[PDB]
Amino acid sequence: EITYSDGTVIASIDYLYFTTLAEAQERMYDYLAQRDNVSAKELKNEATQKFYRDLAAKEIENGGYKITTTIDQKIHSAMQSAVADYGYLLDDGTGRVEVGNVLMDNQTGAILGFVGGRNYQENQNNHAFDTKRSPASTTKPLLAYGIAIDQGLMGSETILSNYPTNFANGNPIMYANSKGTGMMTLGEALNYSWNIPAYWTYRMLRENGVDVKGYMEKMGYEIPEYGIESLPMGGGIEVTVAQHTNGYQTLANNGVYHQKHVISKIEAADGRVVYEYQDKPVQVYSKATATIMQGLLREVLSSRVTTTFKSNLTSLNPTLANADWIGKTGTTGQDENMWLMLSTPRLTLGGWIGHDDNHSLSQQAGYSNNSNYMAHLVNAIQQASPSIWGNERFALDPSVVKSEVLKSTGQKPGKVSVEGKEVEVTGSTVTSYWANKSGAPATSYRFAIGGSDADYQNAWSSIVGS
Amino acid sequence: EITYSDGTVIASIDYLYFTTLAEAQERMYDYLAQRDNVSAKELKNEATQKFYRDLAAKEIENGGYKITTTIDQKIHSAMQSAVADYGYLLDDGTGRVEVGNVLMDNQTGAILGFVGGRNYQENQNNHAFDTKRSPASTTKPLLAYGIAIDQGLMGSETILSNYPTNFANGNPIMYANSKGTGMMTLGEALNYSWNIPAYWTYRMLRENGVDVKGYMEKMGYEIPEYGIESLPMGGGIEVTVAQHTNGYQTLANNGVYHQKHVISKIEAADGRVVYEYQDKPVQVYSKATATIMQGLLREVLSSRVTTTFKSNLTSLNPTLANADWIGKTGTTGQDENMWLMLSTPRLTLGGWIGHDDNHSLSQQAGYSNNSNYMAHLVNAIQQASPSIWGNERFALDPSVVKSEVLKSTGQKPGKVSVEGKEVEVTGSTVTSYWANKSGAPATSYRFAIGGSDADYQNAWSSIVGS
Numbered sequence: 023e024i025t026y027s028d029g030t031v032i033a034s035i036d037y038l039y040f041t042t043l044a045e046a047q048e049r050m051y052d053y054l055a056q057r058d059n060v061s062a063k064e065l066k067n068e069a070t071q072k073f074y075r076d077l078a079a080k081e082i083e084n085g086g087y088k089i090t091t092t093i094d095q096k097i098h099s100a101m102q103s104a105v106a107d108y109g110y111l112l113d114d115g116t117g118r119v120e121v122g123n124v125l126m127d128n129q130t131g132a133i134l135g136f137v138g139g140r141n142y143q144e145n146q147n148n149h150a151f152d153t154k155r156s157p158a159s160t161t162k163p164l165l166a167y168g169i170a171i172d173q174g175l176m177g178s179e180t181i182l183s184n185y186p187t188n189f190a191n192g193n194p195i196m197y198a199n200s201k202g203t204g205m206m207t208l209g210e211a212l213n214y215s216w217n218i219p220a221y222w223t224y225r226m227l228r229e230n231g232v233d234v235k236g237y238m239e240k241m242g243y244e245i246p247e248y249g250i251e252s253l254p255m256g257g258g259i260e261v262t263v264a265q266h267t268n269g270y271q272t273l274a275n276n277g278v279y280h281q282k283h284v285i286s287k288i289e290a291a292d293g294r295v296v297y298e299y300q301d302k303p304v305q306v307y308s309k310a311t312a313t314i315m316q317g318l319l320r321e322v323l324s325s326r327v328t329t330t331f332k333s334n335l336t337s338l339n340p341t342l343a344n345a346d347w348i349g350k351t352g353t354t355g356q357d358e359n360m361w362l363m364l365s366t367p368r369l370t371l372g373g374w375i376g377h378d379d380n381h382s383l384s385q386q387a388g389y390s391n392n393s394n395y396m397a398h399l400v401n402a403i404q405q406a407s408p409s410i411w412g413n414e415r416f417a418l419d420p421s422v423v424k425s426e427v428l429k430s431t432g433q434k435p436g437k438v439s440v441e442g443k444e445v446e447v448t449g450s451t452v453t454s455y456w457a458n459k460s461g462a463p464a465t466s467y468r469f470a471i472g473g474s475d476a477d478y479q480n481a482w483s484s485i486v487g488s
Numbered sequence: 489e490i491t492y493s494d495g496t497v498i499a500s501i502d503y504l505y506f507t508t509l510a511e512a513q514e515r516m517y518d519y520l521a522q523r524d525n526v527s528a529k530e531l532k533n534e535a536t537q538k539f540y541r542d543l544a545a546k547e548i549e550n551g552g553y554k555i556t557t558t559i560d561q562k563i564h565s566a567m568q569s570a571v572a573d574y575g576y577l578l579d580d581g582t583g584r585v586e587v588g589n590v591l592m593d594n595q596t597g598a599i600l601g602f603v604g605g606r607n608y609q610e611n612q613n614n615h616a617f618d619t620k621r622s623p624a625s626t627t628k629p630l631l632a633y634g635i636a637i638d639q640g641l642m643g644s645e646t647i648l649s650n651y652p653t654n655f656a657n658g659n660p661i662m663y664a665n666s667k668g669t670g671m672m673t674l675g676e677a678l679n680y681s682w683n684i685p686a687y688w689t690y691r692m693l694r695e696n697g698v699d700v701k702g703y704m705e706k707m708g709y710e711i712p713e714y715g716i717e718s719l720p721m722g723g724g725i726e727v728t729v730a731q732h733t734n735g736y737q738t739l740a741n742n743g744v745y746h747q748k749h750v751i752s753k754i755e756a757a758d759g760r761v762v763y764e765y766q767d768k769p770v771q772v773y774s775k776a777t778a779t780i781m782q783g784l785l786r787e788v789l790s791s792r793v794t795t796t797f798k799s800n801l802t803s804l805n806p807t808l809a810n811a812d813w814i815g816k817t818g819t820t821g822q823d824e825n826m827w828l829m830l831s832t833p834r835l836t837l838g839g840w841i842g843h844d845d846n847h848s849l850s851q852q853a854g855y856s857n858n859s860n861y862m863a864h865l866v867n868a869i870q871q872a873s874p875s876i877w878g879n880e881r882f883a884l885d886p887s888v889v890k891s892e893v894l895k896s897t898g899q900k901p902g903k904v905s906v907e908g909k910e911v912e913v914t915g916s917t918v919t920s921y922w923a924n925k926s927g928a929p930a931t932s933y934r935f936a937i938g939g940s941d942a943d944y945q946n947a948w949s950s951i952v953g954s
């Protein structure tokens with residue numbers, strides 16, 4: 023039979039059933055092929071695969087295996103009741119809205135609970151484990167800003183260009199209906215989720231030959247082509263909620279990745295271990311980088327620019343809203359998919375909404391609807407398991423380097439030549455957090471990530487006038 | 489004894505007790521003085537006033553009077569439970585935060601319920617009816633924008649200057665730490681609650697000789713000096729919550745004022761009517777103006793720039809959050825007082841928070857704390873009386889005039905004299921709602937409310953940009 027993590031039987035041999043059943047069958051496939059001495063060469067034959075897949079299914083059926091899952095029964099039940107009771111809050115006037123959520127332990131990668139969809143009876147597609155969609159702007163902290171910080175190419179108060187710029191094909195890089203503004207901090211870039219700063223960040227990574235793919239593959243992401251301008255905005259990427267939750271698990275867990283899983287162990291009746299989850303922790307980002315990103319992602323939620331989440335949760339459960347929440351939102355180019363990823367030090371909860379056929383949601387479906395739904399979901403989870411989110415706080419690792427930098431440039435105050443006239447770059451300052459050894463460079467002319475000659479003249483006009 | 493609106497006995501002869509008792513005594517005082525044929529001259533004498541004041545008190549105490557209040561018992565009790573249960577949500581790290589609320593019937597001026605403070609036992613000060621504080625930016629819809637619209641000087645998409653400008657004394661007009669930006673619609677001015685636009689608006693009213701005082705006095709505001717630069721920002725105004733609620737009642741009720749009251753009737757034991765509230769409706773703003781303002785204040789709340797209220801309420805009670813809420817926040821110069829005024833077509837709920845000794849609150853006390861508290865208050869009210877808020881919608885009155893104007897100038901497209909070459913003014917347009925006969929004028933060089941020559945060249949720089 024299939025059990026929760028506490029031995030309680032889920033079933034003998036709905037989303038839960040079919041999902042845990044499917045994972046187990048995959049594990050039984052590997053075991054059975056190995057048992058029967060099937061080489062990888064013969065395992066490539068498609069008729070052989072169908073046989074061993076059918077075999078794996080019957081072994082579970084007419085066999086006496088104990089399948090131990092990571093599922094927390096109380097927490098998963100409560101998530102089902104939340105989507106039953108509160109699912110309808112997602113419906114935004116563009117048809118029935120589908121949903122997928124995964125709740126993951128940050129220290130193990132274990133999946134404690136999930137939401138497969140609005141209602142298994144009406145639609146069986148598994149939106150937590152099977153559906154794959156662009157993660158949109160939630161790509162940014164992982165693939166762009168996170169890597170640039172880790173490479174010591176950027177710190178927390180570094181300045182980026184959000185000046186209008188075009189893709190290679192002459193099209194304006196857009197952010198809803200805006201073609202861009204001017205220079206801005208990483209903080210503002212993340213809080214608003216502007217697109218141009220992420221484009222430049224990724225361009226810079228390519229220019230420095232960074233092994234971006236090495237980072238992503240260490241987190242289990244399969245991206246077929248890295249040579250894409252809109253990659254950091256989610257272009258050319260498609261992920262399940264379970265896999266993408268694993269990325270945010272990595273950032274939340276001070277940069278150490280643990281592979282997601284639902285099955286922890288399968289035993290024969292007599293105790294033989296057919297399968298057991300083996301942990302393989304990987305330091306994907308430096309502790310400095312991850313803890314710096316946590317600080318930035320904390321302000322993403324607290325600024326409330328792209329999500330009402332903290333307001334929604336404050337009202338439902340103000341004590342829970344005082345835990346140390348960080349998170350990032352995502353919106354695809356036509357409002358086809360909305361993401362909201364949330365973490366406390368203990369747990370990450372991933373969330374996607376969208377339509378199965380990929381037509382648009384409303385403009386506010388992620389900002390308001392999904393944020394409100396996920397507040398209910400977070401509150402249901404806590405009510406069922408009152409300690410599970412924890413009261414720990416995210417905190418800068420000691421290894422973090424702090425520089426005093428000029429707010430205007432994001433770099434150390436000093437002299438720079440602005441068209442002939444060697445100039446004293448003065449003015450008010452902030453602490454910038456870096457994940458290298460030396461911190462922030464002295465100010466340069468091209469002080470920002472990205473920007474055209476025209477842009478930099480314009481910016482320096484402003485700066486120079488004070 | 490004193491009774492609820494339905495005749496149920498409140499008490500025989502704690503905020504509720506002393507409030508209804510004190511109002512009843514003022515009424516008995518008037519009645520007794522006239523009964524005894526005391527002259528207006530004689531009633532100026534201080535010893536005579538005191539005797540009649542004492543007389544009015546004992547008359548109630550000993551007599552067999554029946555005082556009929558407007559108070560709704562279920563609603564008032566539920567408001568007290570909310571402040572008892574949820575008042576702590578106001579505490580923001582600047583010490584114990586005090587509070588006053590008044591719930592008013594928009595069609596009658598009757599007060600259904602109120603919150604005098606956090607806890608009468610601990611602090612007897614009545615923050616609904618007694619204490620007077622600057623209403624800050626909740627002054628703007630009433631005294632500046634409202635009047636300019638009624639006077640046919642402004643419409644809903646009219647443009648205003650938020651360019652830096654100084655008071656007469658040379659100090660910058662501030663908005664938090666901003667000295668201003670550029671031109672902006674009335675909508676954006678209202679959603680953000682910028683200060684400079686209101687300054688210019690009131691200046692314009694002065695220049696036009698508008699009887700501003702006549703309006704405010706018809707709503708029962710007592711402002712001793714109108715010649716004040718910061719009046720439209722709440723400088724030189726101090727008001728009770730009950731009185732200010734009456735101002736928002738006026739806007740909500742399509743421009744028609746009804747005097748606030750808690751006492752509807754006082755009867756001698758034998759049936760003689762000692763006092764009876766007499767309704768005297770007044771059309772303060774035209775129906776056009778008021779319904780245009782309603783539309784603007786709907787977006788103040790829905791934009792969520794200065795209050796999280798709509799998010800807070802959506803999570804508590806999504807069906808109530810779909811009623812037609814409009815409102816305005818306010819914040820005094822040093823964060824000493826926060827206001828949030830809310831209306832549906834049926835009710836108006838005013839709220840203030842602050843400290844008895846007038847020291848600062850936190851930056852977010854109004855934006856988040858008071859908004860969350862008031863969402864709980866509003867929800868408590870609805871639970872106690874499920875239909876009281878109504879599902880009616882605010883709607884433009886038919887007498888409203890609609891003009892197509894340039895998004896850029898807020899005036900009708902046309903040729904203009906731009907410091908040299910006559911220019912054909914083109915570009916995207918919108919509907920602008922006016923309360924006059926002829927709607928928006930054709931574009932003129934000085935198209936916005938306020939702005940220096942310097943400002944106007946700069947603006948026309950961009951507009952002439954296309």
Ligand SMILES: *[B-](O)(O)CNC(=O)c1c(OC)cccc1OC
Nearest residue numbers: 158159197198215352353354355
């Ligand atoms: B990211 O997915 O948050 C970038 N977001 C957007 O580009 C975006 C959008 O694109 C069509 C539409 C509305 C809001 C957006 O981001 C706030």
Ligand SMILES: *[B-](O)(O)CNC(=O)c1c(OC)cccc1OC
Nearest residue numbers: 624625663664681818819820821
């Ligand atoms: B009005 O009271 O809304 C004008 N508001 C402000 O000036 C204000 C402020 O001044 C101390 C500080 C923070 C936020 C404000 O309003 C948005």
Ligand SMILES: [Cl-]
Nearest residue numbers: 036037038102
């Ligand atoms: Cl399920």
Ligand SMILES: [Cl-]
Nearest residue numbers: 037040041148
């Ligand atoms: Cl499934």
Ligand SMILES: [Cl-]
Nearest residue numbers: 026028094095
């Ligand atoms: Cl369990």
Ligand SMILES: [Cl-]
Nearest residue numbers: 154155156359
């Ligand atoms: Cl997609």
Ligand SMILES: [Cl-]
Nearest residue numbers: 189191193194
């Ligand atoms: Cl394109």
Ligand SMILES: [Cl-]
Nearest residue numbers: 233234235248
């Ligand atoms: Cl790569």
Ligand SMILES: [Cl-]
Nearest residue numbers: 243244261265
């Ligand atoms: Cl993937």
Ligand SMILES: [Cl-]
Nearest residue numbers: 247248249250
């Ligand atoms: Cl590549």
Ligand SMILES: [Cl-]
Nearest residue numbers: 045283284285
């Ligand atoms: Cl698994």
Ligand SMILES: [Cl-]
Nearest residue numbers: 307308309310
């Ligand atoms: Cl490290």
Ligand SMILES: [Cl-]
Nearest residue numbers: 323324332333
């Ligand atoms: Cl917060």
Ligand SMILES: [Cl-]
Nearest residue numbers: 330333796799
């Ligand atoms: Cl919000």
Ligand SMILES: [Cl-]
Nearest residue numbers: 377378379380
């Ligand atoms: Cl669909």
Ligand SMILES: [Cl-]
Nearest residue numbers: 424425426461
């Ligand atoms: Cl330094």
